[PDB]
Amino acid sequence: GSVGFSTGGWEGGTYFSDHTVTTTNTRQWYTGILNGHRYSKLAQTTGSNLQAAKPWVGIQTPWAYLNLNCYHCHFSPQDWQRLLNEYKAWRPKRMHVRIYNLQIKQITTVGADTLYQNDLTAGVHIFCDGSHQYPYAQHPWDEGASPELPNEIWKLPQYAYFQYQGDLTDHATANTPQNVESMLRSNIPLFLLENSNHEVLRTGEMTEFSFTFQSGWVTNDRAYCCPQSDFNPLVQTRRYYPTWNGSSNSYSYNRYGPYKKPSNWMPGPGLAYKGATHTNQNPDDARGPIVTTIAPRGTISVGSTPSNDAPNDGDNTISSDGVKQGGWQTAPVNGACSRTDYPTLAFDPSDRSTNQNIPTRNLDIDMTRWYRVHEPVRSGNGSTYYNVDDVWMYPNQVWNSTPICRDNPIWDKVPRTDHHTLLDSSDGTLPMKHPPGNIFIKCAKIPIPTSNNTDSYLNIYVTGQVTYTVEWEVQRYQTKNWRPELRTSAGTYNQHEIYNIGENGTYNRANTFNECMPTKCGINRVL
Amino acid sequence: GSVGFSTGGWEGGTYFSDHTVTTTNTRQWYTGILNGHRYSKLAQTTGSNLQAAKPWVGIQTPWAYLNLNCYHCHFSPQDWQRLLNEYKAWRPKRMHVRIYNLQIKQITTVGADTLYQNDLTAGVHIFCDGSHQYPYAQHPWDEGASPELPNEIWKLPQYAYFQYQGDLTDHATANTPQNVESMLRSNIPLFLLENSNHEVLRTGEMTEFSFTFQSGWVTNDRAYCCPQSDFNPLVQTRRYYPTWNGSSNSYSYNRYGPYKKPSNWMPGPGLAYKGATHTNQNPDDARGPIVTTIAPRGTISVGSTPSNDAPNDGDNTISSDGVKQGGWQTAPVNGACSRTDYPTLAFDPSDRSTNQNIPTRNLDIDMTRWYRVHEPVRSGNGSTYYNVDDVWMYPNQVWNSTPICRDNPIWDKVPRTDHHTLLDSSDGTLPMKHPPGNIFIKCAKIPIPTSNNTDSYLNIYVTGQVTYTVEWEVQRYQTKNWRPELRTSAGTYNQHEIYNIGENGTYNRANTFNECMPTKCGINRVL
Amino acid sequence: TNDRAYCCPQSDFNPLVQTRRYYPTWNGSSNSYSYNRYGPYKKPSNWMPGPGLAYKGATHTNQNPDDARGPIVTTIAPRGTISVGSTPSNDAPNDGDNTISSDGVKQGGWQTAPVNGACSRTDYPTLAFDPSDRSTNQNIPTRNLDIDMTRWYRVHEPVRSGNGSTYYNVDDVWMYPNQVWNSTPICRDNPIWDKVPRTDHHTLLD
Amino acid sequence: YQTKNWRPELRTSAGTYNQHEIYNIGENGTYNRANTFNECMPTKCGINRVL
Amino acid sequence: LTDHATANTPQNVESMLRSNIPLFLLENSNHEVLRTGEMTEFSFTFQSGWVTNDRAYCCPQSDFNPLVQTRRYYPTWNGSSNSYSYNRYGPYKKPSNWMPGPG
Amino acid sequence: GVKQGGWQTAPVNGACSRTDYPTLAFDPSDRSTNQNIPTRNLDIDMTRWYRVHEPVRSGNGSTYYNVDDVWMYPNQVWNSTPICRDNPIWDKVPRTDHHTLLD
């Protein structure tokens, strides 16, 4: 008889050790009924009017889901400081999630007054998709992650997923196969969570989930030198550099100076592009820096026209408007270029922020990450130094990843595909094949009798507690550095009261990326 | 199925034996929702206006806590009488606290009428901090301790804690380091009880806590003589006292009279100061007798100005107003001086007292505690007898502690610091490293669905029973005294009906410190 | 000990709860006291500011590095001996004791510094040092930074005087019961230990 | 140390010092030492204890 | 490197770099001190790829058999019809799946 | 600024044999007085490419674009440069979060 028995306590606190950090967090969560207990088409209405449907079309579900992906979910500002000061590297190992102390209440109107009364026999649907049968649909930077403050109520975000690009229209030429658009539309998936197995829980019940991570490392230490400066000037190099003689049409040689020795190591791959920065209008346009247009041959997308003049030769050229609303954008794409760390990653530390100050990633002091790359080419009497904005993958590229802050997402799901290149994120998330599965939650749909076969349900909502524990594998730094180093310190910040509760419970959050306590500031690594 | 089963009975009564007294008390307690389930800045607005913030700034929490610290919590007036009459000494050994028979009710408005209905699935957060991770914030003399009468309802007091002194402002001179105020403000702690582990209980559940005391003794017997009178006049002393001869510029000697023999034993340390008694206005001013101004070099407090004239030499002198609102006061500081027992300890016997008569400690008949101390110094023809208001710690000081009454606090937490001197309280509480930990209680925060992301919770309150049992180590007196002695007796009091229930349930409480049944009145100890 | 106190023991209470304690007010007409509850935002504390002697020493001149400046200067000499700049004084209080001139105390005495104890006001400038031996640096590190909140700036004993009260600065706070304090901060350039002199008695070692 | 403090704290950091090159070897082997007591890295700055 | 402060940059980055420079003194580690009658030795184990002495006499793209026809066709753009027509690759250049290495 | 401020990576020829020369030149020994400087001009391996062209239909004919930068792309296959007795044996891989293929 667990109506009067709790199914759990409250669990909080972090534990530090040499090889392990364990974070434990409990939140009170709730969800009401979403989308009237039904699945429905979700389509974007925004964007400049064009003779086509808007690109994103999908399904919004009745379900809600748990999002644990961000560091401020797991670490308090204190704990994050201690992680960054005492450890050169960490990665998540295993996560345990308990859902318990469930309460299901009927929302009742007896009059001008709204009543909240237990329905003791009402259930809650809880489903973890761990085999990734359903669309994951988790953008790492989404709001609706577990709130930073343990005392804050967490309203579950609603689950929706992409279905098809609505902008695609049938296009028939001598250069295309027939009926490709209808072929795409016929093949769109529909995912209903009710054709899978899940648990239904009443108020005296609990459920739990365990996940094991496989990921690379987040690395807190930085390089104080680039690989290319890293030689010894007191020793001469045997290497010579050529000088072209226009008279003899040959080369002569001179020893490289001891203070620049040619390196075998390439600057890491980096794409320095801002994207389209020219206007703030139309938040649903694809700004950049990389915009990808998907469309199969035989279909034509927004603002696309076939072009019969070379190089295109029957391919569809896409106007600015077409690329802008039709395409899908990848940002940041800076890679190893530190010049474009800014302003290509900017975020709110929390959801629904009223702060006018937007933290943007301006601080990278790691010295393997490059500002500019130049290819000098002999031209006439002198040489022309060509800035290279696109440094692609090339052998012997060696670089460090961007710094991250407590407000970054922890992981990003690697799309399941035939092939992928090296996995390094420009935003710093850990790419994971098999990230922890979506934990889906919805109130039971309790029908109300109707004579006319209308869909009428009882108005209820579930609240409960969720405890999530992450075991973090972690490595303490060791150094022979004689000097003291930069450390994350509260005294660095222009906002002295940051992460403190103020008048009327206002909680102070970072104005800047530095106040978000970024990694790779303090600890020197030897290359 | 404990919805219909109680988790405990009612436990009351005291048990006396030779070496042990056991008090058992049960109270019905409740708390509603505090501070709207949130943490917020708590700042004092009172005091004379000054160009600075008011000193005390802190955090008021959603939590409530149990306060067992006072004797009238544990002992009935009868039981206290018997303790003081039959025992020379006692100390608390172990305490057991049970919280049970929990009821959690929703407060509902259906109309002009307010309804109280069980929420059977609602929880209660109960947390004991026994490792003193959170601020203790218990002033021994606070109200909100368990009520004296077993039948009285106990409303849990709300927990709040100090954070920083708001009066401190940055002060930069050649004599100070830079940016100390921002350094203080940056380093202020924030304590959220939800990052620790605690129990959540529904109505069919209970919890219990055990504590072990380490303390010195409360001592009921008194000295009938001072150490300095304690000799035998029928025997001559070999000791001589000097007399200065101004003519020969030397000393001559004469045997001490047998009825004052010089003693090796110093009067105990005592600071005789009233504090600032001149006005009753501004209850938040620091009156005395010892006022401590905290402020680091590089900061400047209220009413402070740097003074470049000696002795100060760049130190900040503080005006009366600055000391008055800015400082922190220590009272009583009488120590072994009985002259300043009055009026330096005065209190209400109970919380929210309407009695105009305020018990103040005027009765100390222990003879080791001194009225005045004089240092005579030869001056001219005679000698000048200098009153000494400050007797500091000196070797061979020997003294008895102040008497206490049933309305005193039992213990006081020793602040955790690098160093402390001898622990003797002028108010009589037992200093304890590791006093019993705060038991924190709050109603679960049960969210109400809102579309606009406002914070809206279900209005509930918890009531329960708390049983607390203290085992007291105790010592019976033994004496060869031939004569009968003073004993605590109901017939001593001008109020004959004291501790009786009167018309309409009015409970009579002590008008005077004597009616509070003070210790160290009755039993003679041999020195 | 590396950790610090962010509050003094005397601020450390809960203002949301009233105190049962009252403070006296003297009535000169009735020659008695009346009582009023302490305000919830200053609750009288059982805990004394730690012992502290706020004295600079003799700061007036830089000459004569071998003079005993302070803040505590101890003259040793047994009865039957006379030290530098000492003369017997037959006028009270001295009565045959040797009074010592400034010069005598100055070169003859032995100095104890720092003697600030729990007073943070005199942390400066009573501890100043070179980080290394034979330093050429004109900048002398001196201990100006103490943010520990148990260590006190000033102590006042207010005493009712006439119509108002006089607030007496206390430069000497001696050992007294229920004093609780944290030790001074140290730096990487401090000595680790000091040998306790072997003696019959010593007080608390801080 | 162990703390339940929610907030980050002061820590000893090289970036605090007006002398940026402190404890570094300079020209001709000159070793840079603290000008101030803060540059000597004093204790009891960072960690909060609960009383 | 010199400090540069604009609306587009964070503050005090140069001093931040200069403050964080390492200093390495070999005397804070453990090493051997040897007098004239003493010796010391060290062992190392390599992990590496191979140095390769043999060469390719052909590129991967020439490496086919001309006596066999390829089924593959190559496009030719017709500007009049705006479409492609196809012709079998000649047996002596067969399109290769293998790209020239990065250079 | 680029010239004195930057740090240079050479050789970066990769699989291009055209730029084997003159991008690697050295003395065989230290403090050489020899005016003749060995420079790597001899690569007869046939997987290593001289030029790469992307032809693009332009007007009536096609334009053959020389490609001086061939980046990493799938199905690139190549042999490493020849080495001589005077080359270094190894190079320390910088310790970093990421590296591409090591050649």
Author numbering:
A (entry chain A), B (entry chain E): 41 to 567
C (entry chain F): 259 to 464
D (entry chain F): 517 to 567
E (entry chain G): 208 to 310
F (entry chain G): 362 to 464
Authors' own words:
To expand the structural repertoire of determined capsid structures for the diverse Bocaparvovirus genus, viruses infecting dogs (CnMV), pigs (PBoV1), and rats (RBoV) were selected. The ORFs of these viruses coding for the major capsid protein VP2 were cloned into the pFastBac1 plasmid to enable the production of the virus-like particles (VLPs), using the Bac-to-Bac expression system in insect Sf9 cells. In the icosahedral capsid, the 60 VPs assemble via two-, three-, and fivefold symmetry-related VP interactions, resulting in pores at the fivefold symmetry axes, protrusions surrounding the threefold axes, and depressions at the twofold axes.
The first porcine bocavirus (PBoV) was identified in Swedish pigs in 2009. PBoV is usually associated with diarrhea and upper respiratory tract infections in piglets, but a case study in 2016 associated PBoV with a case of encephalomyelitis in a 6-week-old piglet in Germany. The capsid (VP1) amino acid sequence identity of PBoV1 is 42% and 47% for BPV and HBoV1, respectively. Following cryo-EM data collection, three-dimensional-image reconstruction of the capsids, utilizing 50,866 (CnMV), 98,388 (PBoV1), and 9199 (RBoV) individual capsid images, resulted in a resolution of 2.72, 2.31, and 2.52 Å, respectively. The high resolution of the cryo-EM maps allowed the building of reliable atomic models, starting from amino acids 34, 41, and 42 (VP2 numbering) at the N-terminus for CnMV, PBoV1, and RBoV, respectively. In the case of PBoV1 and RBoV, the cryo-EM maps for the most part also showed densities for the carbonyl groups of the main-chain and densities for a specific rotamer for the individual amino acids, guiding the model building for these viruses. Capsid structures previously determined for the Bocaparvovirus genus showed disperse protrusions surrounding the threefold axis that do not significantly extend radially from the capsid surface. In contrast, the CnMV capsid shows very prominent threefold protrusions, while PBoV1 and RBoV follow the previously described characteristics of the genus. In PBoV1 and RBoV, the shorter VR-III does not cover the entire twofold region, but their loop also advances the twofold axis and restricts the size of the depression. Another feature previously observed for the bocaviruses, with the exception of GBoV1, was the presence of density extending into the interior of the capsid below the fivefold channel. This density was also seen for CnMV, but is absent in the PBoV1 and RBoV capsids.
